[PDB]
Design a protein around this ligand. Structure first.
Ligand SMILES: Cc1ccccc1-c1cc(C(=O)N2CC=CC2)ccc1C
Ligand SMILES: [Ca+2]
Ligand SMILES: [Cl-]
Length: 371
């Protein structure tokens, strides 16, 4: 089971596509909900995601159908299409996924942020870093649910530097565009969802705390945080979860005024990556780093809960640390950080020592020795 949120609020979930094109916004939305009696949300909702996942794991079209058999009915503990909880302005997180992932695969983070009173826009990237995504060729395809599938792009060694930077840059623009879309919805603009779903987008009118916006992401999404913050001053802080810094151009590192928090795993990180994180440090800027002890790259993704301990460890989805333990540390430190830098008036400051990695499962800064 993906763990339920630890915060006071019930959690809802819906999908938003606007516009219907490969250049429009695709996001999954987690939000505080009025009721707690809807059906749970389908974790991986289409078979083409499983196919895109098999291709990414380097297996047959056939193995994709085996993953669909084992995982195709799995839900996440979010009320599918619940009415949004009224009477409060919610701060907003935009979430960017890792390479080979897509919008649905960080529900343990998205569900927990929402239970504490956030709206979470987990975006699906059309940069061919997702395992699979979809859009509609035109208005007619949009209406009759004729989906066009975009699958993960495999690079040559040659293409790496250039293409990953193009992608981190498209990701940033997709984060900005997702933010602009939500703000318009808030500012009352009627948007016709390209997906026919029994959730009225009008509910979101006057629901956003327009000044309290952050960008969070994992892996490629960690670099998306950094690129995003450098382009969009609307994002007031960022949290890079096990950032893979390689996509970033040399120019970004000196150009991030916003508070920025690195939550790293113990076993992913490496000198070249840490050095790139250090390139972001400055005395005039807010910068914080923790390492979760006993943890691995996928400890931030839902895959960490998808299996038992032995299969999980073998496939590098679980570490020596319990997954709920590791996600609680990441989520709770995130909560305290977001409170500090968005000016929230909640109890998240109860977790301030986590920002400094004062905990037995936390390392202050990094374990990685450099120069
Ligand atoms: C556990 C799981 C459930 C359903 C679909 C895929 C997977 C899976 C996932 C990864 C993984 O670590 N990934 C990170 C990004 C994309 C896949 C590795 C192996 C498997 C079997
Ligand atoms: Ca901009
Ligand atoms: Cl790892």
């Amino acid at each position: 089971k993906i763990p339920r949120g630890n915060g006071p609020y019930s959690v809802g979930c819906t999908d938003l596509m606007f516009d219907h094109t490969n250049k429009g916004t695709f996001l999954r939305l987690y939000y505080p909900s009025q009721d707690n009696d809807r059906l749970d949300t389908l974790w991986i909702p289409n078979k083409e995601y499983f196919w895109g996942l098999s291709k990414f794991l380097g297996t047959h079209w056939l193995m994709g159908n085996i993953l669909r058999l084992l995982f195709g009915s799995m839900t996440t503990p979010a009320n599918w299409n619940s009415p949004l909880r009224p009477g409060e302005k919610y701060p907003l997180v935009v979430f960017s996924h890792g390479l080979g992932a897509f919008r649905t695969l960080y529900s343990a983070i998205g569900i927990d942020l929402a239970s504490h009173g956030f709206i979470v826009a987990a975006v699906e990237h059309r940069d061919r870093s997702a395992s699979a995504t979809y859009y509609f060729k035109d208005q007619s395809a949009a209406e009759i649910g004729d989906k066009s599938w975009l699958y993960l792009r495999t690079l040559k060694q040659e293409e790496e530097t250039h293409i990953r930077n193009e992608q981190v840059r498209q990701r940033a623009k997709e984060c900005s565009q997702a933010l602009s879309l939500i703000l318009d919805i808030d500012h009352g603009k009627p948007v016709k969802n390209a997906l026919d779903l029994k959730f009225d987008m009008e509910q979101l009118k006057d629901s956003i705390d327009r000044e309290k916006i952050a960008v969070i992401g994992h892996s490629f999404g960690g670099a998306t945080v950094i690129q995003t913050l450098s382009e969009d001053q609307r994002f007031r802080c960022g949290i890079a979860l096990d950032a893979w810094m390689f996509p970033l151009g040399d120019e970004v590192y000196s150009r991030i005024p916003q508070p920025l928090f690195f939550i790293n795993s113990e076993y992913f990180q490496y000198p070249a990556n840490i050095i790139k994180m250090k390139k972001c440090y400055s005395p005039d800027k807010e910068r914080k780093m923790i390492t979760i002890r006993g943890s691995v790259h996928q400890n931030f993704a839902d895959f960490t809960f998808a299996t038992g301990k032995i299969i999980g460890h073998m496939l590098k989805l679980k570490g020596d640390i319990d997954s709920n333990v590791a996600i609680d540390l990441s989520n709770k430190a995130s909560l305290a950080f977001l409170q500090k830098h968005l000016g929230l008036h909640k109890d998240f400051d109860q977790w301030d020592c986590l920002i400094e990695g004062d905990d037995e499962n936390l390392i202050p800064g990094t374990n990685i020795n450099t120069t």
